[PDB]
């Protein structure tokens, strides 16, 4: 069996205490990163699944084990795909991480529990976000079905169907699966192969990398004369990387505190690539790879590198402090428990603008009709156009309003 890395990024959405990590575990086997130094940087974890098919019935086709002994046929499984999971939490406080996750995602998985109430605002918000950020491949999954009645589940399904009609997602498949009992995952696997294809990707496009997580490889007990370099957990959308290249983290860093800053973006040479489980020479875009570079282990510690752009040497993108946005607003607010009408944008107000993966606070200067000018506090970079989600404050915490695009 060949040790091929991740091909396409699949993300999972839900709610707090509903069950997402458990579902992930059921799907794959290797436990999630979340659940001080290691793993702790963002809200998303790290998981990997296997797609191997046995074609020699009905729904039973794909499996989780490398060896086929369970269904009947003793023959070895055929290699189809290998996928990486991006598990994003569905909490009312933390959403920036989710947004960041969304930017890299190519496939989405919705989770709704049976026993709880049918209309949930957070789930709706998530769906809206998915719709916004160039995602159409959505599979609806029912979580807790075993604790529900014979007709109640059907009713719930009907309600769901009624709800999802006017949205961009038209032909979304619905699967009921148990997380604690471990059943019906084969159908899900089959669907993964059926409904979702891999988009065309080539070597010709300029390298662009997005870092979500940060890692320091330091072990207690062992002497200091045996050290390991700083690892940046970064996912790639476009551009193939190989071992032996120069990488730079774009936005900038503060090194001296009197004296104006002039220091260039953080340069680092690649030491070792961590994909799936074992090290590989080539990096195929469409997965999260722990890129171990010559960067400090102290820098890759905690909340320092959350959603930052990474480029290869011989390419020049632009850095902006003032940004030109083309926005579109929604009718009523999504996320609030009660629904409130969206007000027109007022000059000079603190609003959270999420350009791809960056979590930045911006203030409005001029409003016309569709075009808006924003002043940023923390530095941000622009490459092409980018997919932007906008968030405002009305009551206590952040609420989503609509979508935006950079006009440059």
């Amino acid at each position: 069996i060949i040790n091929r890395q991740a091909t396409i990024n699949i993300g999972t959405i839900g709610h707090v205490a509903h069950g997402k990590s458990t579902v992930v575990r059921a799907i794959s086997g290797v436990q999630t990163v979340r659940f001080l130094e290691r793993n702790i940087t963002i809200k998303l974890g790290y998981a990997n699944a296997k797609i191997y098919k046995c074609q020699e019935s009905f729904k039973s086709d794909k499996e989780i084990s490398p060896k086929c002994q369970r269904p009947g046929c003793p023959g070895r499984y055929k290699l189809v795909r290998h996928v990486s999971f991006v598990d994003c939490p569905g909490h009312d406080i933390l959403m920036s991480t989710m947004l960041s996750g969304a930017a890299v995602m190519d496939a989405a998985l919705l989770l709704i529990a049976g026993n709880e109430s049918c209309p949930q605002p957070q789930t709706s918000e998530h769906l809206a976000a998915i719709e916004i950020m160039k995602l159409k491949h959505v599979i609806i999954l029912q979580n807790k079905v075993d604790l529900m009645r014979e007709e109640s589940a059907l009713e719930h399904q009907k309600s769901i169907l009624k709800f999802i009609r006017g949205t961009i997602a038209d032909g979304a498949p619905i699967v009921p699966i148990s997380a604690q009992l471990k059943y019906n995952i084969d159908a899900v696997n089959e669907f993964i192969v059926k409904t979702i294809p891999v988009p065309p990707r080539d070597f010709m496009i300029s390298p662009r990398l997005i870092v979500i997580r940060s890692f320091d490889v330091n072990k207690p007990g062992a002497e200091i004369e045996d050290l390991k370099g700083g690892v940046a957990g970064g996912s790639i959308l476009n551009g193939v990387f190989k071992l032996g290249d120069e990488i730079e983290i774009r936005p900038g860093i503060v090194t001296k505190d009197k004296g104006k800053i002039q220091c260039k973006p953080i340069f680092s040479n690649i030491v070792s690539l961590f994909a799936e489980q074992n090290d590989l020479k080539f990096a195929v875009p469409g997965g999260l790879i722990g890129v171990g570079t010559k960067v400090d282990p102290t820098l890759c510690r905690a909340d320092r590198l959350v959603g930052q752009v990474v480029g290869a040497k011989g390419h020049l993108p632009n850095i902006y402090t003032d940004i030109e946005i083309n926005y579109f607003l929604l009718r009523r607010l999504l996320g609030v428990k009660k629904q409130a009408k969206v007000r027109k944008l007022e000059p000079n107000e603190v609003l959270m603008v999420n350009i791809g993966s960056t979590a930045t606070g911006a203030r409005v200067v001029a409003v016309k009709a569709d075009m808006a000018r924003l002043q940023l506090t923390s530095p941000a970079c622009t490459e092409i156009n980018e997919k932007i989600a906008l968030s405002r404050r009305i009551e206590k915490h952040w609420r989503l309003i609509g979508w935006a695009t950079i006009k440059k």
């Binding site: 079905v145 399904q157 169907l161 699967v175 009992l181 019906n184």
Partner: peptide
């Protein structure tokens, strides 16, 4: 389209502890 879901549901109902 909501047609092969029913069969799956039935199967789930059948296979339980």
């Amino acid at each position: 389209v909501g047609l092969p879901y029913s069969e799956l549901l039935s199967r789930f109902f059948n296979i339980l502890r």
